[PDB]
Enzyme design. Structure first.
Site, short mmCIF file in Angstrom:
data_model
loop_
_atom_site.label_atom_id
_atom_site.label_comp_id
_atom_site.label_asym_id
_atom_site.label_seq_id
_atom_site.Cartn_x
_atom_site.Cartn_y
_atom_site.Cartn_z
N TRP A 13 0.82 -1.20 0.00
CA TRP A 13 0.00 0.00 0.00
C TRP A 13 0.86 1.25 0.00
O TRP A 13 0.65 2.16 -0.81
CB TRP A 13 -0.92 -0.08 1.22
CG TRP A 13 -2.06 0.86 1.38
CD1 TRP A 13 -2.69 1.14 2.56
CD2 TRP A 13 -2.80 1.59 0.37
NE1 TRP A 13 -3.72 2.01 2.36
CE2 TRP A 13 -3.82 2.30 1.03
CE3 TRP A 13 -2.68 1.73 -1.01
CZ2 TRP A 13 -4.71 3.15 0.36
CZ3 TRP A 13 -3.57 2.58 -1.68
CH2 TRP A 13 -4.57 3.27 -1.00
N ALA A 146 -4.37 -1.84 -2.94
CA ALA A 146 -3.02 -1.37 -3.24
C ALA A 146 -2.56 -1.82 -4.61
O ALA A 146 -2.01 -1.03 -5.38
CB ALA A 146 -2.06 -1.87 -2.16
N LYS A 197 -18.46 -1.60 7.47
CA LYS A 197 -18.77 -2.32 6.25
C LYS A 197 -18.45 -3.80 6.38
O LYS A 197 -19.12 -4.63 5.78
CB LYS A 197 -18.00 -1.73 5.07
CG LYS A 197 -16.54 -2.11 5.07
CD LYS A 197 -15.84 -1.49 3.85
CE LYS A 197 -14.34 -1.74 3.88
NZ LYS A 197 -14.01 -3.17 3.81
N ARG A 262 -12.47 -11.02 2.30
CA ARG A 262 -12.33 -12.16 3.19
C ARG A 262 -13.44 -12.20 4.22
O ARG A 262 -13.81 -13.29 4.65
CB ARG A 262 -10.98 -12.15 3.89
CG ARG A 262 -10.68 -10.89 4.59
CD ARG A 262 -9.38 -10.31 4.03
NE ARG A 262 -8.22 -10.76 4.80
CZ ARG A 262 -8.04 -10.45 6.07
NH1 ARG A 262 -8.95 -9.72 6.70
NH2 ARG A 262 -6.97 -10.88 6.72
N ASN A 263 -13.96 -11.06 4.66
CA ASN A 263 -15.10 -11.12 5.57
C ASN A 263 -16.27 -11.88 4.91
O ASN A 263 -16.85 -12.78 5.52
CB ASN A 263 -15.50 -9.70 6.03
CG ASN A 263 -14.58 -9.15 7.15
OD1 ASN A 263 -14.85 -9.33 8.35
ND2 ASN A 263 -13.50 -8.47 6.77
N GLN A 289 -11.82 -8.86 11.15
CA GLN A 289 -12.23 -7.60 11.77
C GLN A 289 -13.74 -7.43 11.87
O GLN A 289 -14.20 -6.78 12.80
CB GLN A 289 -11.63 -6.41 11.02
CG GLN A 289 -10.14 -6.21 11.26
CD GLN A 289 -9.81 -6.01 12.73
OE1 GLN A 289 -9.82 -6.96 13.52
NE2 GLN A 289 -9.51 -4.76 13.11
#
Ligand SMILES: [K+]
Ligand SMILES: [K+]
Lengths: 340, 344
Positions: A13, A146, A197, A262-263, A289
């Site tokens: 990034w 990124a 989100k 991935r969530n 997260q």
């Protein structure tokens, strides 16, 4: 006179941002062309990464195959990198920003300002930075990643910055034909979107894994967005307008995260396989997260007595932590406040 | 007394809606359980429905409730009704309104479930206005991220109701809402309704990004800028109040997402981008020559915006038009988004 820039961070990034920032800092009179980038020194086959960057102009470990503008200078000591900077761009992993701030505290230039590109989190990361370092903070958040920014693939981002003139300067520093910026003044609203989100995205993944189609998924996303808005209004200081959620930080990042990320992927597998979150973090992510944020939301909403106002957020928490059957996730949305 | 309902239409969508409305009219005190449903009769139909209680041609497998009566003549279906639910293919609404003109009960009101847009003195004209002016009745609309097969199957989804009058809005919400068909009533009719036509233009752009191989972040920007152009176009074009917040209802962002990730406009646009076949050719191959509405709507937007001197303020809408009709190379689509008004 001209403003000096330091990029605090140098991974995928931070290197991708250095490509953009180095170019605008050279071209535009209002910026000093000497852009420092703090690079944690590493030994790359007998040679210092910072020396490789300052000779080959390529971060051969984290962004191989891309040239950085030669006016970007790698600096291994974070204080030396930052100490004469007027503008600091924080682009390190969430895990490390606390330690980095503890080293920088007290060593910055007077009137220095910052912008955080660290997405995630309750205390906003940009607040942690600004409190420890004593500098005014902006944020940069949107539907972007990124590698695509490095590859100049077209995308947008939002900059949240309270001061209009400082917002315009940050836009000028960061914008290119393939990285389009909208500046808004609601810093907290922009930043909280990045954390909330991922909670919605877990729900979207549940929906996928339960076999539901795109119209059901569109309802989950939209109700999720409605809960993001309501939560931001009760939690954020500063003005919180539903209009900010139309920016890239809101609806666009929500869409892309709920359709790929991935969530969503861990959530689909949880609903289809039976594996716990933790087991799935092990198999696919070597901490997710979304569920942790839901947990923190539960705690805040209890304090405020508003648990029952946020059934999507709370169903994500209950399913991930308290054993509520994932198969009940849609039922939790059948008496939503938005339809009362 | 209790309010009488006529469902004007009986297709896949009209039959799906019959299930809900028949169920709720029978159940709820404030509605007369006898719900008429106008059926264009077919050799192979209205008799089959009232006997077997199933639209064997248009909703095979499903049970329409028994208090729902097929009626072959639309005036007889509608003439005692207080609430008319228009749910026919757009191509028939004109003819239906011409048969119904002057034959409606005093104070009757209407709601349109017909997604799309018509033609008129201002270029585009909302179907609800075509209906409401032809018949002289107040009109509401119902639009959102939903499809007939899933409403009949009771798969969870939402919709928006646009209705100017609060008490009428609440009545319509009671007639239509179930645990798997959730309704938000808003006061802006035109805004809810105009989303249905404009979303198909954005979906053509989303299909271009899929067929050119861009990823989800590029596509999310195309969708979002498309939404920003929907908002700005509705603000300059629509009658009645226009709120950005209305676009966060199911009629706006949700139907936009679902249409940009699945639907014929997206699919045909992707094929155009991938193969270089013309829209007309793809319509022939994929849609029996049926006309894809997204490109057609884009042409109408172009005319409206050209008469206002505003072509330059809607680069996405206008790139869809120029790619589909003026030979602009589809590979240039993204370039047309790199100097967008939203980023000025
Ligand atoms: K310069
Ligand atoms: K009844």
């Amino acid at each position: 006179a001209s403003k000096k820039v330091c990029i605090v961070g140098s991974g995928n990034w931070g290197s991708a941002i250095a490509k953009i920032v180095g170019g605008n800092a050279a071209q535009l009179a209002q910026f000093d062309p000497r852009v420092t980038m703090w690079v944690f020194e590493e030994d790359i086959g007998g040679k210092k990464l910072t020396e490789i960057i300052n000779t080959q102009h390529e971060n051969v470990k984290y962004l191989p195959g891309h040239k950085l503008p030669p006016n970007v200078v790698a600096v291994p000591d974070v204080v030396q990198a930052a100490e004469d900077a007027d503008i600091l761009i924080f682009v390190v992993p969430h895990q490390f920003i606390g330690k980095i701030c503890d080293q920088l505290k007290g060593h910055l230039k007077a009137n220095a300002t910052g912008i955080s590109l660290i997405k995630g989190v309750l205390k906003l990361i940009s607040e942690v930075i600004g409190e420890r370092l004593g500098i005014p903070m902006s944020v940069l958040m949107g539907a972007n990643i990124a590698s695509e920014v490095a590859d100049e693939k077209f995308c947008e981002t939002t900059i949240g910055c309270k001061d209009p003139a400082q917002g315009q300067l940050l836009k000028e520093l960061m914008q290119t034909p393939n990285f389009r910026i909208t500046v808004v003044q609601e810093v907290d609203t922009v930043e909280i979107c990045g954390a909330l989100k991922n909670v919605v995205a877990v729900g979207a993944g549940f929906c996928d894994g339960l076999g539901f189609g795109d119209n059901t998924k569109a309802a989950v996303i939209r109700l999720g967005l409605m809960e993001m808005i309501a939560f931001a209004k009760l939690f954020c200081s500063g003005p919180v307008s539903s209009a900010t959620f139309l920016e890239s930080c809101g609806v666009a990042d929500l869409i892309t995260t709920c359709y790929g990320g991935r969530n969503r992927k861990v959530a689909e597998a949880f609903a289809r396989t039976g594996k716990s979150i933790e087991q799935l973090e092990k198999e696919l992510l070597n901490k997710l997260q979304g569920p942790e944020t839901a947990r923190e939301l539960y705690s805040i909403l209890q304090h405020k007595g508003l648990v029952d106002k946020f059934p999507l957020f709370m169903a994500v928490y209950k399913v991930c932590y308290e054993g509520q059957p994932v198969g009940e996730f849609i039922h939790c949305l059948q008496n939503h406040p938005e339809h009362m």
